[PDB]
Amino acid sequence: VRARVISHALKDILAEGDKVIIMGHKRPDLDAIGAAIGVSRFAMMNNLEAYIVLNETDIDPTLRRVMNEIDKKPELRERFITSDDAWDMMTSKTTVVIVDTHKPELVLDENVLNKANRKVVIDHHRRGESFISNPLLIYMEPYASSTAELVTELLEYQPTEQRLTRLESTVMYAGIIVDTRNFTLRTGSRTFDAASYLRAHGADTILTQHFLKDDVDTYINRSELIRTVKVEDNGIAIAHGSDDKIYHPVTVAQAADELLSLEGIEASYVVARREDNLIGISARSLGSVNVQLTMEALGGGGHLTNAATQLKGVTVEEAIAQLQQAITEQLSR
Amino acid sequence: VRARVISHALKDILAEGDKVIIMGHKRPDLDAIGAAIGVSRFAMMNNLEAYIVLNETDIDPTLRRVMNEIDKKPELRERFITSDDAWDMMTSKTTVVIVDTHKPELVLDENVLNKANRKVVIDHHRRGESFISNPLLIYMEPYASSTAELVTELLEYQPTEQRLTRLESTVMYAGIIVDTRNFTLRTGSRTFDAASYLRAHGADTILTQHFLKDDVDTYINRSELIRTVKVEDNGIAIAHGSDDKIYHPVTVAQAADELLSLEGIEASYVVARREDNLIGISARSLGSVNVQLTMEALGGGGHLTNAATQLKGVTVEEAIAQLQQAITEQLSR
Ligand SMILES: [Mn+2]
Ligand SMILES: [Mn+2]
Ligand SMILES: [Mn+2]
Numbered sequence: 084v085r086a087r088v089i090s091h092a093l094k095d096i097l098a099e100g101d102k103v104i105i106m107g108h109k110r111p112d113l114d115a116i117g118a119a120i121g122v123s124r125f126a127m128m129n130n131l132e133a134y135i136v137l138n139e140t141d142i143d144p145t146l147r148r149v150m151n152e153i154d155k156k157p158e159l160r161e162r163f164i165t166s167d168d169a170w171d172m173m174t175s176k177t178t179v180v181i182v183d184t185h186k187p188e189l190v191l192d193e194n195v196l197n198k199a200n201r202k203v204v205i206d207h208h209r210r211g212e213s214f215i216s217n218p219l220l221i222y223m224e225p226y227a228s229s230t231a232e233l234v235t236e237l238l239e240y241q242p243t244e245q246r247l248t249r250l251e252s253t254v255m256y257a258g259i260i261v262d263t264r265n266f267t268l269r270t271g272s273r274t275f276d277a278a279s280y281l282r283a284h285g286a287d288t289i290l291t292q293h294f295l296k297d298d299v300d301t302y303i304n305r306s307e308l309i310r311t312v313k314v315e316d317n318g319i320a321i322a323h324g325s326d327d328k329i330y331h332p333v334t335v336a337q338a339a340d341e342l343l344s345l346e347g348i349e350a351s352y353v354v355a356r357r358e359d360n361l362i363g364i365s366a367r368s369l370g371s372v373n374v375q376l377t378m379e380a381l382g383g384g385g386h387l388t389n390a391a392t393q394l395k396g397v398t399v400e401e402a403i404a405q406l407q408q409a410i411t412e413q414l415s416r
Numbered sequence: 417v418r419a420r421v422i423s424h425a426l427k428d429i430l431a432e433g434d435k436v437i438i439m440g441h442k443r444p445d446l447d448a449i450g451a452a453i454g455v456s457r458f459a460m461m462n463n464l465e466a467y468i469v470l471n472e473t474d475i476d477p478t479l480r481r482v483m484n485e486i487d488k489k490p491e492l493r494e495r496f497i498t499s500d501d502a503w504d505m506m507t508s509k510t511t512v513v514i515v516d517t518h519k520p521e522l523v524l525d526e527n528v529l530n531k532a533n534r535k536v537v538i539d540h541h542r543r544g545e546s547f548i549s550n551p552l553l554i555y556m557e558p559y560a561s562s563t564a565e566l567v568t569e570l571l572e573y574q575p576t577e578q579r580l581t582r583l584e585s586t587v588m589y590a591g592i593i594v595d596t597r598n599f600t601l602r603t604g605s606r607t608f609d610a611a612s613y614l615r616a617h618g619a620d621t622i623l624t625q626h627f628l629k630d631d632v633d634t635y636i637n638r639s640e641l642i643r644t645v646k647v648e649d650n651g652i653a654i655a656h657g658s659d660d661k662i663y664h665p666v667t668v669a670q671a672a673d674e675l676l677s678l679e680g681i682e683a684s685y686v687v688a689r690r691e692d693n694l695i696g697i698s699a700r701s702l703g704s705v706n707v708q709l710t711m712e713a714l715g716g717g718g719h720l721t722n723a724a725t726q727l728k729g730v731t732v733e734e735a736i737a738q739l740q741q742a743i744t745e746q747l748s749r
């Protein structure tokens with residue numbers, strides 16, 4: 084019933100101003116874009132005027148794959164405008180809806196935020212210190228999977244002559260996929276209700292997969308690391324890169340994450356050269372083995388299930404030796 | 417709609433007999449076991465007495481992880497009985513419910529089936545030549561994801577005091593996950609509606625992950641195949657094992673599955689030696705390339721997205737050339 088009330092109050096706020104400007108966070112991912120797209124359908128269902136703020140430099144390679152689809156459909160492509168155009172078209176009666184963030188310094192264009200007199204915030208994160216000043220409406224649900232999930236709930240209570248389209252529901256659906264790691268994290272019954280709504284409007288599994296495809300080369304580098312793993316009887320897994328090959332930190336972190344998906348692994352440590360004189364270790368855990376303590380013992384840190392260190396002046400071999408020492412230490416307490 | 421009527425018609429049939437015996441197919445997977453668990457909760461929501469037929473020899477390694485969790489953490493185990501105990505227990509007033517199959521010779525214990533005078537069939541496969549004899553109720557829905565999805569909908573209409581437990585809903589949920597490959601196949605809005613109901617009752621997505629983890633050797637063998645892939649500009653990918661290394665057929669199929677998650681791959685063909693005189697090829701596609709036609713051209717077959725063949729007396733290099741001949745013949749324009 085609470086989404087129903089938010090939904091009708093947002094419709095009133097939007098109808099009230101002269102148009103709607105929608106913005107997510109700097110370097111938008113598919114949830115910020117999908118949420119923004121959902122709010123522009125919200126406005127349209129009510130024959131209101133709405134735009135989504137996006138600059139060419141905001142479009143990372145995952146987003147470019149979405150934009151290539153959006154370009155095939157002008158009703159949808161025409162809603163996207165630059166920061167400059169957004170600035171130029173705003174009056175004191177324009178409503179800016181901020182999606183998928185709540186912190187002024189994270190918003191995609193802070194200057195557009197500063198220009199605005201009427202603000203709405205829809206977000207699924209834990210509110211901290213800074214916060215959008217004087218919103219007319221706040222829809223925050225730190226338990227929700229994603230802003231797409233939140234906006235999908237608002238859509239249900241709005242007129243249906245101008246329905247969510249197939250492409251639009253696919254982008255929203257992909258945002259939920261990215262934020263939940265395919266219904267693996269932060270996923271509640273309401274996440275599945277949002278998926279059902281999106282799916283009933285044609286959200287396309289295959290196109291979503293197309294957006295999220297992995298590169299062949301990075302799959303092959305990640306698996307070079309993994310193919311070396313050795314797993315001890317207590318579930319401790321160690322994998323490494325060879326001493327004269329430098330690995331991208333992103334690949335090392337992924338390999339560490341990927342080891343946890345395999346049977347029998349309680350915690351993973353992946354040791355790979357980072358530079359000419361620098362060895363990285365990425366550490367992950369299911370949650371029983373504390374990889375933070377072992378990385379701290381080696382001059383790094385992070386969290387209980389996710390930590391790392393960088394070791395100056397050692398080979399990969401020596402790094403592996405110092406890690407085994409730290410692990411033994413910790414295990415004998 | 418059909419769901420509401422079937423749910424009340426099922427409750428009448430089950431309460432009219434003296435008890436309920438539930439069976440899936442031989443070598444049961446998680447959808448068979450979760451659907452059976454769901455049916456037995458359907459019985460208990462109505463204070464009927466219900467059991468599921470399972471013998472020790474029916475328990476594969478995946479099912480064994482489920483049964484270990486069931487022994488350690490609930491009392492679900494008492495509702496599982498051997499073929500013999502089921503036999504000893506049935507009368508002409510016992511209702512046998514068949515889940516997730518409809519062919520007599522695939523039923524877990526065909527003698528239990530033949531003793532039943534009262535039968536019910538719930539299945540999501542396409543009806544075929546043989547079929548259960550003279551059932552009191554047939555619920556066949558070929559477009560549903562899974563029998564777990566079908567049974568979940570029936571539970572929604574039943575009294576709610578004796579609620580589905582957390583672990584019961586997890587196993588039901590795991591059978592959806594397996595049958596849909598994590599919501600990428602045969603997944604409609606009703607599939608998500610069933611996932612919502614299960615998650616609301618505590619279905620644990622992390623425990624589900626634990627049940628399904630692949631082992632390290634399989635990852636490694638599989639990535640040995642994936643690393644050879646060559647992707648053509650038309651989306652056609654071929655990978656292969658060397659001519660002197662035998663691969664497990666499961667690993668070949670999984671390698672072909674996994675190539676479809678990579679950028680630029682519309683159809684994958686994985687060529688690898690199966691015996692000293694036999695080459696296997698597994699083929700998968702995202703729906704634009706008909707790998708059924710390709711494998712039919714090489715003396716095999718299967719479906720539009722999933723096909724295979726086996727080639728006698730050739731090297732993998734010979735098998736590859738025959739495959740490329742068939743490919744360019746199939747897609748020449
Ligand atoms: Mn985001
Ligand atoms: Mn988000
Ligand atoms: Mn099955």
Ligand SMILES: [Mn+2]
Nearest residue numbers: 447516562563
């Ligand atoms: Mn099934």
